[PDB]
């Protein structure tokens, strides 16, 4: 809730390889 680095720095660290890999193993981005 309050730990404001923690709510959101593991989200990103998430996102960023899961939206990476959307664009590789789903085919519509690869670099």
Same mark, same amino acid.
């Given at each position: !809730?309050? $730990?404001? @680095?923690? %709510?959101?720095? +593991? %989200?990103?660290? *998430?996102? %960023? @390889? /899961?939206?990476? $890999?959307?664009?590789? /193993? *789903? +085919? !519509?981005?690869?670099?």
């Amino acid at each position: !809730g309050f $730990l404001d @680095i923690i %709510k959101d720095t +593991g %989200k990103e660290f *998430a996102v %960023k @390889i /899961l939206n990476n $890999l959307k664009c590789k /193993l *789903a +085919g !519509g981005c690869p670099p």
